[PDB]
Design a protein around this ligand. Sequence first.
Ligand SMILES: *P(=O)(O)OC[C@H]1O[C@@H](n2cnc3c(N)ncnc32)[C@H](O)[C@@H]1O
Ligand SMILES: *P(=O)(O)OC[C@H]1O[C@@H](n2cnc3c(N)ncnc32)[C@H](O)[C@@H]1O
Lengths: 457, 457, 112, 111
Amino acid sequence: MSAEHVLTMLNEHEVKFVDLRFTDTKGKEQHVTIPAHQVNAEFFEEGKMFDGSSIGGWKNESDMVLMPDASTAVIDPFFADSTLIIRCDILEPGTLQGYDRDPRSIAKRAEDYLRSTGIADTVLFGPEPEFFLFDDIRFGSSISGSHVAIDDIEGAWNSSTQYGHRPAVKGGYFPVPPVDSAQDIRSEMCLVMEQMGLVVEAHHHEVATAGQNEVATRFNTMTKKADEIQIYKYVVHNVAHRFGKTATFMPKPMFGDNGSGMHCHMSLSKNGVNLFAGDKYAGLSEQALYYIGGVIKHAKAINALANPTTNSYKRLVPGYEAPVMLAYSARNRSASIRIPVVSSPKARRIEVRFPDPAANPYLCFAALLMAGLDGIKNKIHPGEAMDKNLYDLKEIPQVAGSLEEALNELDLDREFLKAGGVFTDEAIDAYIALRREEDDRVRMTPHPVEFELYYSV
Amino acid sequence: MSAEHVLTMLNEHEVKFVDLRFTDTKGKEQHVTIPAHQVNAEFFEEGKMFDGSSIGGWKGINESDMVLMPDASTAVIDPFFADSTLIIRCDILEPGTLQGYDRDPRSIAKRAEDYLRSTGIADTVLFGPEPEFFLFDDIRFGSSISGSHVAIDDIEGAWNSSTQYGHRPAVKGGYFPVPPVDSAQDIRSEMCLVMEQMGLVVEAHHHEVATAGQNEVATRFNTMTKKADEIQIYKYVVHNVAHRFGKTATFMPKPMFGDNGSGMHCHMSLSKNGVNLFAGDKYAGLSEQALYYIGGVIKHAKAINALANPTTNSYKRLVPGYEAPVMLAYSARNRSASIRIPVVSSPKARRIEVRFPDPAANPYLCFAALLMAGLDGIKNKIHPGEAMDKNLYKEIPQVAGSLEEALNELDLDREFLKAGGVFTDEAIDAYIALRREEDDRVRMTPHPVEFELYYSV
Amino acid sequence: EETIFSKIIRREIDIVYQDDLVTAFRDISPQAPTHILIIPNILIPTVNDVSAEHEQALGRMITVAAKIAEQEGIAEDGYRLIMNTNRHGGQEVYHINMHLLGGRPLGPMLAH
Amino acid sequence: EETIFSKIIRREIDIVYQDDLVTAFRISPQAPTHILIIPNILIPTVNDVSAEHEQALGRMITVAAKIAEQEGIAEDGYRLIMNTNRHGGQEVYHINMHLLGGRPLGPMLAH
Ligand SMILES: *P(=O)(O)OC[C@H]1O[C@@H](n2cnc3c(N)ncnc32)[C@H](O)[C@@H]1O
Ligand SMILES: *P(=O)(O)OC[C@H]1O[C@@H](n2cnc3c(N)ncnc32)[C@H](O)[C@@H]1O
């Protein structure tokens, strides 16, 4: 679309309010609403001034410009009044250039750097988020202690709860519609997503009980796919709220059951041909192997962006169907990087399984793309594939086991993100500080399991 | 003690009632009380006639009465009744003939001892049972057409860490805790004191592995019939002391799932003219007679299982993968062997330890079955084979996996325990019928776990 | 002192092959479908006690192993030569005994 | 024809002990003390051992004992395992005797 198209759409749909939306460093979507009559031709050329001091990690004077993107005009399906959602970029007031800490500006810089390197023209992302549907969640903390309570009908622990078909633990994958009580909610989510520009492939119940559901969305270019992931999170949250449920994208909400993950499919295209298709292992090319090697080498530094929460590392544990070995294979379930089998060379891609849904889409995608580009530029070989049985069987590098370790690796390993000006040093420092605050909070607070273990000793 | 000693004891303690006690086929202790003035010289020569038709397996088509013949050597003052009561254990004898009733367990044990003396192998047999029990604050169970339920509650239970009313033993972690953690120190001390007051000899008492109050009081060995009487006194003492402390004591094999069960390790020793026949120059200091005893126990072990594991719950703890051994082999170091050889300082105390029997077993019947199996092995010279010493270089048999299998084996292999008239075919048939009634009741009723598996399918 | 394999060397008591320094015997309890043992003719307690004097026979052990594998025809299928020592591995002979396991597709090295 | 160990002998590409006919290496630790021994002369498979090069076979175990004394594992227990052809799992396609120890070793093979 364009500015004129948005102006015509305002009259066509009788729009009353225009919502300007943007994403902070944490990944949350912020929005400011303005009346429809306040949108003019000069609005798309000058933007709206706003203060980013209250936004975490964006802190003498913090007056910044909200520049709307007319190509992202989407009618809000949930607001009572007719509202048009326009995604916006954060720009500096004077130079009118992308803010260094703006995730969308960083993603656009990464795409521009990819185009400038001459390696490829476009990058394609295929993330597959997962979410949990709950009826009631209660958490709190104080000097007296802390607690968390998760309750929903589909939970296997409600077999005898006063108020009988519900999924068992680790057995909610593809159940009957009576047991899978999340069919109408998923269908409504798919319809709302299609109303908002998303293309939905399939939706199904996930392995974990207590209402884990997955809605599959078609791939797109990196920045558009990150915007689509933001819209996906928004619609999931709101449609869950409208049905009396609550939706969370937390990686490991409960122990003893499968966690939520975000497998990302990556591909590179130049002049309309797939650069990851060749005659190497699993139908890949030399550039695909270089991309895999670059991802593997900087994977621990990636974890600070693709796994920014401490629950993401309670998911990334040996066992429990969460890959931790940083190898690539087409059949090995333990490999973090997987090469899916496809019918045509045009759809050959590389799948990374360690990222979590709580990750910032822009930052995670930019980090993965920059790692792959560094691997291609430096010609980093991924090594031999982990698809061989050596004498029926520990030097394989492992994904970062804690948020502190990932943040330290990100602090030490910075060049692959600083190449091309995609990630400035100040933005990385601010992100590290923001994540370290949460790490300190989670580390300093006593755990109930600590009481179960070390109260009588 | 003789009848005169019993009369003098009655006069000295101002005893007002005399309790005549005996054990039925199921193992329960049945008692009938009479006034002290009804006890005289002719009482010990003629006994008291009673109707045993109401007893479980003592029914007869002729509805004949039976005689309660007191044993003066078993006189002991009851420590729980408000009035002074003297407990006298009695044997069930047929009228006129004044011979031991065929279905009376004590008469069967006496017959087994007489057969052991008559065969000439040994003069005395020593038993070293080590019963375990659970202490529960409250137990609620029920069954009906609408369903069944069981609920166990105790302060020491690990599940009560959040129950409103904080040192408790963890699951499989109640073995030798600090005095604050285990709340049964005073109860066990009182049990030991009152057991020693009743003629028992106590070695040690301690908390056992399972949570929710599993305790063991060790008692010294004795001859077979006297040791069975001591086991009955042990059960009575445990039950009454638990009742007087506001607790509930159970000798059920596997009251809880996921926690250690209750077992009764039995130690065997044959003595002739004061020397221990089980001491020799064979494996682990054993003799040839001891090896033949082990072989006889192994060969008939399934037949013994009907008497040493009378209950369906007895095979909930005999499932492989727990503390209770299941393999039909003997070793001095291997934990998986059902027959163990304890290490002792002197040959005078060398014994054979069998570990499959449960505390729910009838003491007289279980001891008689084990002794008869050992005697058959000695007479037929059944070599057990080789010890289960795990070397890094003929499938090992196993105990019965269900009560039905053990009952069938007892029905088929009943000749070893019919030698010398220790058991008569009517006794085995009645015992099998009573155990099959319980087996049918357990098998024909729906299980709550079945609803967790076969309700949505 | 000596072991039962010393008696077998003396021929006082299933010989597969005989040589001045190396002999091959069938296992009493074959742990593999084709389990053939190999020992030196000179009594040596452990391989830890091997000196350069008898190191000539140690190569003859492997040569006899190859010859026996070819004779049995298990050369193409594959075989494993195991020579355990000391407390680990269940050394219960206290004499040099090379194991030749073959026929069945064998498992992994060690036990894991 | 030639394997990785062939280039390792030429030093064209973690040596523990080097001899005229025997070289020792430390590459994926399967045991706390996993050290390999190969012949300097290339032998594709142990069945193809010729009597001309059969003398280094004894020096293999001699070096193994020397290493076990050096490694301090001779007081615990060790195995000398040679895998051959497909059933053994010959991966380097060259003679390679494994000196493994440092922890209680299991049985000869896993059932
Ligand atoms: P470990 O290598 O210590 O045990 C060697 C095995 O050799 C077998 N074996 C022992 N004795 C004989 C005889 N006399 N004949 C054939 N095979 C024998 C056993 O399997 C030992 O475990
Ligand atoms: P198989 O019984 O042939 O065992 C294969 C062993 O080869 C070792 N290995 C392969 N490649 C190397 C290199 N480059 N350096 C050292 N060791 C190597 C593996 O350690 C296997 O144990």
